[PDB]
Amino acid sequence: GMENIKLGFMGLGQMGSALAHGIANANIIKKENLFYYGPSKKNTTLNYMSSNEELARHCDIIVCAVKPDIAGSVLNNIKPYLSSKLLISICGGLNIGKLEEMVGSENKIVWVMPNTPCLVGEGSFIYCSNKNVNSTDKKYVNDIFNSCGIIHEIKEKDMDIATAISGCGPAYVYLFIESLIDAGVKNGLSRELSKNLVLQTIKGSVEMVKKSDQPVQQLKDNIVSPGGITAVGLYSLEKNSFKYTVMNAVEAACEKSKAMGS
């Protein structure tokens, strides 16, 4: 049972709308029980509400989907209306300590880190919660995000690196896909065909990792025919520090999450 509880989204930006419509299409909560507020009305199936305060006073679970720089004032305005209610924050960088500083230690605070793929029911989520979040609250959190993806409960200290991989990850994958298509378009292939060949190559590779008992590096080794084509392409990636480039990008994002966390 989750059809009766009222879900409220404070802000419907790029992540807010993706998460809102991700849960809406999953059908675990009734359409008339999904609410939102923004300074401007959005093209959405969710029910508009007059303010964040009236959203917090009506809804049972409140989602903070605003930018972290304006999250402090928004949460301060709904501060007295969070009594006995569950607050879920998707704000990047803002950890439980900073959130407890914004609304109070007495409230139920859970910090969830989503990604945009939840729109197509394939989101990746990580979360941590404060002292006041119980087993029945965690059951609500799990069911909401498992309906439009896969959720893990992790330590609070691991949230910054997880954000860098799971939250920011799509962007690295999008750019990877973008770069592979461009390489194809440059060397004779159409943009449509390049995209098909790229997406199917990645889909197959991911499935191989999941299903095979062999590690990723052995699966990589298997493709390298002695004196062949793949060996030359991989040699090029090593030359240009492909591994370090990816690792450095993730770590740079991880530092930014921690910098905002101070």
Ligand X SMILES: NC(=O)c1ccc[n+]([C@@H]2O[C@H](COP(=O)([O-])OP(=O)(O)OC[C@H]3O[C@@H](n4cnc5c(N)ncnc54)[C@H](OP(=O)(O)O)[C@@H]3O)[C@@H](O)[C@H]2O)c1
Binding residues for NADP(+): 14-15, 42, 65-68, 92, 222, 225
- Stretch of 50-58, 67-75, 77-85, 99-107 contacting its own copies, by CB under 8 A: 67-75
Region of 61 please: left (phi>0), alpha (psi -120 to 50) or beta.
Answer: beta
Binding mask 200-239 for Mg ion (x = CB under 5 A): ---x--x---------------------------------
Do 65 and 15 touch, CB atoms closer than 8 A? yes
Site for its own copies contains 104 (CB under 8 A): no
Structure tokens at 212: 């095979």
Number of residues interacting with its own copies: please give it, by CB under 8 A.
Answer: 122
Which residues partner with 123 through β-bridges? Answer: 149
Binding residues: 14-15, 42, 52, 65-68, 92, 222, 225
Q: Is the dihedral of CA 19, 24, 26, 32 positive or negative?
A: positive
Cβ closest to its own copies, residue 51 vs residue 218: 218
Which 192-251 residues touch its own copies, going by CB under 8 A? 193-212, 214-251
Q: Angle at CA 60, nearest 5°, toward 72 and 167?
A: 55
End-to-end CA distance of the chain: 38
Pick the binder of its own copies from 42, 79, 138, 256 (CB under 8 A): 256
What is the nearest approach in angstroms of its own copies to the Cβ of residue 96?
17
Q: Does 149 bind its own copies (CB under 8 A)?
A: yes
Task: Fill in the per-residue mask, 17 to 46: x = in contact with its own copies (CB under 8 A), - = not in contact.
Answer: -x----------------------------
Does the protein bind its own copies through residue 73 (CB under 8 A)? no
List binding-site positions for NADPH. 52
Distances (CA, A) of 104 to 10, 99, 101, 111, 136: 18, 8, 6, 14, 21
Find out whether 149 and 121 touch, Cβ atoms under 8 Å. yes
Q: What is the torsion angle, in degrees rounded to the nearest 10, for the CA atoms of residue 170, residue 174, residue 175 and residue 177?
A: 140
Binding site for Mg ion (CB under 5 A): 203, 206
